[PDB]
Design a protein around this nucleic acid. Sequence first.
DNA 1: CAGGATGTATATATCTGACACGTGCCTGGAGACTAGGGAGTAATCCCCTTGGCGGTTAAAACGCGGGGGACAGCGCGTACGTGCGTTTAAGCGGTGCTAGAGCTGTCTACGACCAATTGAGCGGCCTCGGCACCGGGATTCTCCA
DNA 2: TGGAGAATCCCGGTGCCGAGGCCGCTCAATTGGTCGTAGACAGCTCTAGCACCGCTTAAACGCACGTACGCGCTGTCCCCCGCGTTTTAACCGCCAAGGGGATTACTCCCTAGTCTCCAGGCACGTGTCAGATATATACATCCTG
Lengths: 221, 95, 94, 362, 98, 98, 80, 81, 108, 107, 104, 112
Amino acid sequence: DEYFDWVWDDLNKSSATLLSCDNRKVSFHMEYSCGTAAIRGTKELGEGQHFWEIKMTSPVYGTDMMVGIGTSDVDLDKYRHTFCSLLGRDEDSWGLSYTGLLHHKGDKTSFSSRFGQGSIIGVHLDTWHGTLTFFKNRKCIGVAATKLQNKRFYPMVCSTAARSSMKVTRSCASATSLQYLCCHRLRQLRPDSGDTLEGLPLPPGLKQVLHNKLGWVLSMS
Amino acid sequence: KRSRKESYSVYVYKVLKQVHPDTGISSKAMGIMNSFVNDIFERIAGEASRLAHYNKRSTITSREIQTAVRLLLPGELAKHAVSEGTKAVTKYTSS
Amino acid sequence: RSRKESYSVYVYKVLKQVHPDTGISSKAMGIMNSFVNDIFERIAGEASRLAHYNKRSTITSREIQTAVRLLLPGELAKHAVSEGTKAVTKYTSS
Amino acid sequence: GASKLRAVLEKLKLSRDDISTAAGMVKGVVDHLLLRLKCDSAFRGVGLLNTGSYYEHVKISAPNEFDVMFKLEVPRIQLEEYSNTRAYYFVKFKRNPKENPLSQFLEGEILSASKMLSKFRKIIAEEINDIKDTDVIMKAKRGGSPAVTLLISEKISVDITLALESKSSWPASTQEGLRIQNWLSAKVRKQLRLKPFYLVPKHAKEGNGFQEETWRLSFSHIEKEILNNHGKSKTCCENKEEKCCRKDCLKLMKYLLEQLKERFKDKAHLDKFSSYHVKTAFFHVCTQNPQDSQWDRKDLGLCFDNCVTYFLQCLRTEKLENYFIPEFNLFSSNLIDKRSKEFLTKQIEYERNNEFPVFDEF
Amino acid sequence: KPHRYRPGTVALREIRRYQKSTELLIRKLPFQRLVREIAQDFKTDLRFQSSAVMALQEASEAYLVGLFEDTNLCAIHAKRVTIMPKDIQLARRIRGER
Amino acid sequence: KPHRYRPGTVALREIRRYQKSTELLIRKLPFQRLVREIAQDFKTDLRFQSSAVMALQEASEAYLVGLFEDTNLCAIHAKRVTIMPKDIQLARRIRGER
Amino acid sequence: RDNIQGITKPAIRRLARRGGVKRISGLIYEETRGVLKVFLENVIRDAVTYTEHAKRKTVTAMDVVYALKRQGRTLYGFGG
Amino acid sequence: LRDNIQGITKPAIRRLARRGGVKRISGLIYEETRGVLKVFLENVIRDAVTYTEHAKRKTVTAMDVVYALKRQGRTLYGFGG
Amino acid sequence: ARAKAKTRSSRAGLQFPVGRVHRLLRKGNYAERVGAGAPVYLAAVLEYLTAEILELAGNAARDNKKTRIIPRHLQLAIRNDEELNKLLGKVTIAQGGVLPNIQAVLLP
Amino acid sequence: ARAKAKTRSSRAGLQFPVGRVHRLLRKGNYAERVGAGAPVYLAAVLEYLTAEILELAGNAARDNKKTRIIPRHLQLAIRNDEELNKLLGKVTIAQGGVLPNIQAVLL
Amino acid sequence: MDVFLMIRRHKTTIFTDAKESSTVFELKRIVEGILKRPPDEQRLYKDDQLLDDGKTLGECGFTSQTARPQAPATVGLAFRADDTFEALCIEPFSSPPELPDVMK
Amino acid sequence: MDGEEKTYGGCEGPDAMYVKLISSDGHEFIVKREHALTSGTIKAMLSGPGQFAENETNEVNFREIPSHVLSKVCMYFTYKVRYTNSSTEIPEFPIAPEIALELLMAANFLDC
DNA sequence: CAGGATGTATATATCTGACACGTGCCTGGAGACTAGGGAGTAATCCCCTTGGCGGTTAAAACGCGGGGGACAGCGCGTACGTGCGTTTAAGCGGTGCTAGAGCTGTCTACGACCAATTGAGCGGCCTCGGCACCGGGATTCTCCA
DNA sequence: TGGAGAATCCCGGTGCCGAGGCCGCTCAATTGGTCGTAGACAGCTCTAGCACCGCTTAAACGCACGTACGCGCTGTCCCCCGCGTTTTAACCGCCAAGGGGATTACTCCCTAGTCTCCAGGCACGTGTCAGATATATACATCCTG
Ligand SMILES: [Zn+2]
């Protein structure tokens, strides 16, 4: 596959986690799970567009494991000694747990079906329209959030189960452009199909470069 | 002060003294008829309170009591008891 | 149109306060209704006779208290006079 | 994962027949004790409560540690709450023709449990010496209801309990309890309410010591009937295919609450927590998820995780209400220290995050 | 041969069902005819409400079934087990209503 | 010595005399003591009157004399002539008063 | 016209079985027929004697319970 | 005053059986007759007192006794009305 | 003004006191508007019925050669006769005694 | 003036109607005046007696395991108690039947 | 505050963003700055009705409400026929196709 | 913005503040210079020599573009050069699906 | 001693009509007031329960001889209990019908109420005659030869 | 076939106490009048007692036959009954003390009667779930061997 756009952050990982597989993989609580542990990704998202996805591997259990977005104002080691949900706790920071429930601002919403061992999850971000979208198993769950404009963020993932691990399978960025915006509007107008390349005399090289740029948009709904 | 007290004596005596002229009666042979007549009183007056509410009759009158005394005397004596209370329903009605 | 009246609701309310979970068929209500009518009239009959025996013009708590301990056997009489006295003092003290 | 649980279930299971071999010793003792007691005017009608299986085996890892309960049938009685505690009552007799049970246990008007137990202790204690084919001994008091406890040789052991039985309608304080309707239909709710109920002797307790002379309700016979006949389909677990993990999920949960006491008994802080609380939380859970479809053996994981989820939630919030008396809070600050509760959340959630380490000791 | 119960074992199966049932034992129409025919010599051309008939039947069943029970206690005291017309005539005069 | 009548004759000669007689047969003062003794368990310090005690013997001995007269009818039905306590316990049960 | 022989042999038997008796004589049937007819002869005479105060041409349930209640036979179920 | 029930003698119980017309007698019956008189008396005397209490008197008089016999269907003619 | 009085018992034809009874009855709670049929019925009936209980003493006193009638003769003159003893048997007549009777198996 | 009607039953604490029993005791021709306390005392004893009966019948009905009380269960409760049976000794309950016993020498 | 608008005549189809308080005369100053015809040599018509330079475009109903980011409202320019308004010199765009049923 | 004399009426040679953009079907869309420079094709073309004289006609006709399409390009430029760096919520840019199907060719035709 | 044949218990599955509810409304249960007389009390008095005494002799407690009544056990043949086959009269569903009981407007005959008068019946003193009672002569019926 | 106690049927004379008669008077029954609503009636209507018609199968009638109950007789030995002896406790006539049941004056607070208002029972009418019903199987008991 094509090379992903950011690793897990060696300088911004909690005091109880090992980064691994060229910082594509990460592992948590390798003995005691004596509290909560977390990381950010190395890249701040606050300009252009972003898309990325994560594969699970250890079986799900324990208090909460979750995926999301937050400011730099978070503390990766406040809950070093305690079980807590780190994501979703504050106006700064959001997340979705494996139980199919979101947190934000220190409050909760049920949002989706559950997910477990070996699951694949994917996320879209648009900073221009200040808005965020969630996918599971190459199918869409929905738009998660909006009104997010000009706030700066890192992507964060958190853990609490002993002997637990995750891997980013792809991560990517783009500008806003016709090949982004018009393609999004086009997919909203024909979401019912498994494909979008159908019926187009449009060159196969351009079909492939939008397989690169918007590989999900052409092939998921 | 003297607190006067009555009995039925003279009214039973005038129904009896018709038949046996040649007799007198000891004191302890009076109480049996007093207590008989007095027993029937509050028993038939209770029947009369019932008779009133039985056929919605606040003016009790002869014909409603009537049934009780063809009832209470078995044999042809049903006719005896009721005959006394039915020979009454003539003259008073005419002043 | 012509109208009829009964103890039905009050005995149903007492039932639903000791077996607050148990029903009664229409035929079984008919017997309970004739039972309370019999007992009222026995008690009232000795009360009215007591007032005559003792030369008075009214029926009050003192009359019914003697009629209850006269028509009720054994330890039913012993208990019924407590259910009586405790309910009237709750009323005179209100 | 689920294989650890399936394995520990076998390792628990296969101990069973040792209990069956031990059960002969207690049988002869309880049979003699009944034939002792039936001689005395105070006890002539007394009997075994659990007919057809003459014990309860209250700790799953303790195959010598039986429990026995005697029902003492009583004519007809009236009850009233101690101090609006809702679950605790004084009891008094009512309208009865002359056939005294034992009014000699009356004190002022209350039936004295303390007088009852004083005689019950004595008559067992003077009898039990005359068991001559077996070494048998009475073990000293611990609390209100199991006030007679008994040991055979140096293993086989019993706590003895007695209870009043009454035939009447259940109290108004339970009217909203037993929320079985959606799970098992109103036709069973009514016919289960069509049974007797039991009172067990129990002091209240206070900073001043204790209101010694008081009784508490009990419903263990009904509780067994639900668990024995636990299907929305009657035939649940009555054939090999219709099997469901409900029973398994409960017995796994009982075992855990002993393992954590074994590791912290020296701290004493967990000592207040019993398999009684574990049952009660399970009844709320199976009421909440009542279709037999949720209880496939191919789960086991989520249902067990739901138990600990529910129990943690209750424990954080200091709230767990009795399933028959729908407002009596067992977890209340009055009955349990805040410190023990929060400490136990820290333990349990640590075990959950560590994938149940303590079952590896088996 | 085939299955004969011994004399007396079907009579006990009988009293042990009539002592645990509720209903009337005499037929309806035959009791109605007797009531009308007894009545027609106190006065002529009466009419009857249906529940006046049922109130006579219930009062007579409970006269007879309660008189046989005192007849049984009389026959057993004399060391018999079979009831006879001499026991009826004892019960009716110790009962004393004559 | 020689006149001694055959047993059971004097037991017929003496019933005739008491059925012609009309006076009262329980010794008076021994019954008067009992009625004050038996009353004390209902109330206390309580006076009586002559006609209140006199009327109460007439009530008592008139029910005893009416009881024996149909115990005697029960023993004869059992082919006996001697009255014995098994008989009176039948009479005061056919008489309804249990 | 008869009508008293309308109370059959097996009917008179069922009454004695609910009353608790095991074995029966054969002369009983013409004895009970003389007892039942003399019971009805007295309650019917009082119920028709009430029906005349009450003016009606019809004998009512309440006329018969006044006659039972007068004889000494109180009866719960028919009202009153 | 106590135990006057033994004042109901053998020969008094014999006088009362002569008027009933009975010929031979079992020796067990004198202990049975004194057992039935005991509860006859009780149910009468336990109502003459309740009339007296309702009257608030201290004395008990013949009318209270005949009201008692009358209540229980043993009615007697000859002492009142 | 004020003509001579005629007793209202004689106005009904009775011997019994239609005056005295109307006081008893109307003050007695048993009925409210006491129409003259009611003091007269409660008075009337009992006329023969109060004499029968000494009329039937001709069965006793003259037959027994006594000229003052007495409680024993009044007893026999009720408890003697056929229907008299059902018509009023449920009552005890004080100082009466009992009728002569022996059962046929007991005599020689 | 006419304020709100507070019924007497709630004051003395009964379920039985303290109002209707007053009107019946007035109209029924028992006495000239009805005192203030009589309708309270009388409703309390009729409460006691009905409450005592209803739960004995309920106990028989519920061991025979039926939803409803019926005349057979009234009979088996009253005719089987030493002092209810004394209180109502001469009344025939319609369609009640008899309670079972066999005389011992018939066996 | 400035309002996104589009001014249309003949070839010209010109996006603009003027202060809402501008006189209709200031539109003419803007038009001279783009198209060199002086403020008076120009005229203005709305739909096909005359509009006075002495007004402000806000009182002429051209406003932030008419100024949607993807629909800044149209205005008719005129260059005088020496004496009068000339024609409303508008000319039509190339007709767009149907979206086919495969996309429906 | 009023009295827009701009010393010379504009800058219409080296820094020509408007540029004149005709479609293949003759509609003319003047655009301001940052909107012009928003196209990679137009910034490359305006970087061409001789065009920097005040004597230049700063005009293009797009033979490859019809007028309805060219209007949406200008709409997109005016929108993005406004809303770039907005801290406040940027409005959506909805364009009608029944005409928009083609417009992705503008990305490669004009570098946009 | 075991083994067969039979009647009762019980546990689903089906269906329908009896009990628990909601509501329109109307008539009987609460609020205020006042005009009398029933019942409460304080003081009185006298008759009738109470407790005591020696007394006569009637009646009860004790004992003892032995006759026949209570009763066990034996014989027995007639009357009644069990059960199979025929056939007849109680109980059921549906029609009619008009005789009779219930409701009501209205009006006039009857019973409650009252003041003034005087006749009926009640309470107290009197006296001889009805039916007891003490001796007693005559006339039966059971029990042994 | 003769005896001889118990009365007992009947009698004499004696005696007393209670029932049969007379008087004073007062209080309750009556005359005469006024008045208001109960109930005696003529019409109406509509529902409950009487009467009729087939059908079904339930149980009343009739019979044979075997056996265990009711019925008679004998012997014997307990358990009263009939008589005399010793004594102890009723009934008896009389007496001294005082307790509370029976009667009055007078005061007032409890009740009935009235008018008004309005909410809790009653009559009605739709729904659904508690028990009756059918059929299959499990079990407990009686009887012959
Ligand atoms: Zn299961």
